[PDB]
From Swiss-Prot, chain A:
Name of encoding gene: SLC30A10
Gene Ontology CC annotations of this record: early endosome; early endosome membrane; Golgi apparatus; Golgi membrane; membrane; plasma membrane; recycling endosome; recycling endosome membrane
GO biological process: cellular response to angiotensin; detoxification of zinc ion; epidermal growth factor receptor signaling pathway; intracellular manganese ion homeostasis; intracellular zinc ion homeostasis; manganese ion export across plasma membrane; manganese ion transport; positive regulation of ERK1 and ERK2 cascade
UniProt protein name: Calcium/manganese antiporter SLC30A10
Family (UniProt): Belongs to the cation diffusion facilitator (CDF) transporter (TC 2.A.4) family. SLC30A subfamily.
Iron-sulfur found in the keyword field: no
Transmembrane regions: 2-22, 32-52, 73-93, 105-124, 127-147, 161-181
Residues annotated as site: Important for coupling of manganese to calcium transport: 34
Taxonomic classification: Eukaryota, Metazoa, Chordata, Craniata, Vertebrata
Quaternary data: Forms homodimers. Forms heterodimers and high-molecular weight oligomers with SLC30A3, SLC30A2 and SLC30A4; heterodimerization is mediated by covalent-bound tyrosine residues, occurs probably in a tissue-specific manner and could mediate the intracellular zinc transport activity into early endosomes and recycling endosomes.
Main location group: membrane
Species: Homo sapiens (Human)
């Protein structure tokens, strides 16, 4: 399924890239860049599926390459942002010095076929983000198709209709992609996942019976679905820690965190094992 | 920080040279390729924002490790931005190789190219997640410096020879796109290590400095330990490596003797962040076994 979509997207990205420069239409170039980003996303999803089956641990990636989806998503979003910045500059350059579409027919045909390939995805807002760019290409083509302009006549309204719609499409694509950048960065910055409410989680954690303190509660998301929590507990050492460990595990299970590595430091409110020597303080995370 | 700020101010001042107040009209086409430094402006803004975010304290119930990795994420973002711009420049140059393009007037292009080269070399001569971020910003400015070098070179070549409009394009026309392609190759080659390293800091992998080949051997060798389950080693920022080892032990003898030995081994390997969970040996569910990190 996805391989056929990938080959179609690659072929038509190349086709639109060749047509836009040859046809002198920024909207076509914008759609070509958008389909290049779409094929990059498809390749990222294929790689994610491949790595998901037969997980590959080892001495290089102890967690496996599960973060590949997130890293590829961030990289693709930044790539699309840079391509959108380039397209915005070119529109602005061609907004002050208007340029004519040399091949309205070819631009129209490539836009129609790109719109068909863009709707095949739903025939099996980013999805709107690509479909609408294709329809902008078409729109410009008809404006240059019906009521055309002779090859030896200056710029008219028909000329500034392509750069304006291209700027609007760039705005739409950037608005759809910036939240993706924010979410991927939050995942990659080891920020607490959106679903997890660490405030009440820490309250419940401090309410467990026989727990005197709680520190170094590191919660971060590996991938969409796997949340990893590293936590340090202090136990009285004449009572024990088994019941407390079970209760803490149940709490983290209720919150959706199944990866817990509770270190039950002995009992006075600081970490009992910062490092081997006092000189490790600058390197320890969250210095005391 | 201060040097990055001064670079940003200089780039702003030179770029704003197009938005004259005057009257109807904007700067008579001296901005046709002035956005080559608006890209540097954007990269500088990204670097400064990453630096500002990184300074935030490693506390609060939204980032338990703190925004220390903001510099690494900004470096990766800047590297990918530079790669995308280089791809676009390469595509434009390739389209120019098939269709030769002349230069309108070597004088103005040479003058603006010399000014841009001077700005970029002021930025270059300023002379460790911050090392990654600066490496990205310096990569971007070096990229535009190479672009300014190629525009200077094509301008001089078009200056010595007249290239009257009667004659079509000659080797002079192809001098610029070919040098642009070579410059793009150089920038991409320089940028690829940056991405390949920042994607190791992100996309959690064993740190390059860490030599796990002997780490696992020593962890097996230390007496008192009966097995090891999840040696999760990853790098938050350069110099801060975190470990999440799981360990078993005979129930009768506590983990006290072996915990200090494990911590000392990890410290000798340059790992000071270790969270050892000691799961005893008898000698919440099973549906959740699909949501773990190790099956
Ligand atoms: Mn499209």
């Amino acid at each position: 399924r996805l391989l056929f979509m990938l080959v179609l997207t690659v072929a038509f990205f190349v086709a639109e890239l060749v047509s836009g420069y040859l046809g002198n239409s920024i909207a076509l170039l914008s759609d070509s860049f958008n389909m290049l980003s779409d094929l990059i996303s498809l390749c990222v999803g294929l790689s994610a599926g491949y790595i998901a089956r037969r997980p590959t641990r080892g001495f290089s990636a102890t967690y496996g390459y599960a973060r590949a989806e997130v890293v590829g998503a961030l990289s693709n979003a930044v790539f699309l942002t840079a391509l959108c910045f380039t397209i915005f500059v070119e529109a602005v350059l061609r907004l002050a010095r208007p340029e004519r579409i040399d091949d309205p027919e070819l631009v129209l045909i490539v836009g129609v076929l790109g719109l068909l390939v863009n709707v095949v995805g739903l025939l099996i807002l980013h999805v709107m983000g690509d479909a609408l760019g294709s329809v902008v290409v078409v729109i410009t083509a008809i404006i240059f198709y019906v009521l055309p302009l002779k090859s030896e006549d200056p710029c008219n309204w028909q000329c500034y209709i392509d750069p304006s719609l291209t700027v609007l499409m760039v705005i739409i694509i950037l608005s759809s992609a910036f939240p993706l950048i924010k979410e991927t960065a939050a995942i990659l910055l080891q920020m607490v996942p959106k679903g997890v409410n660490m405030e009440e989680l820490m309250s419940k954690l401090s309410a467990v019976p026989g727990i005197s303190s709680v520190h170094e509660v590191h919660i971060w998301e590996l991938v969409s679905g796997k949340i990893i929590a590293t936590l340090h507990i202090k136990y009285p050492k004449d009572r024990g820690y088994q019941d407390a460990s079970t209760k803490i595990r149940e709490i983290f299970h209720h919150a959706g965190i199944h990866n817990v590595t509770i270190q039950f430091e002995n009992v006075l409110l600081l970490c009992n094992s910062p490092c081997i020597s006092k000189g490790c303080a600058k390197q320890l995370c969250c210095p005391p």
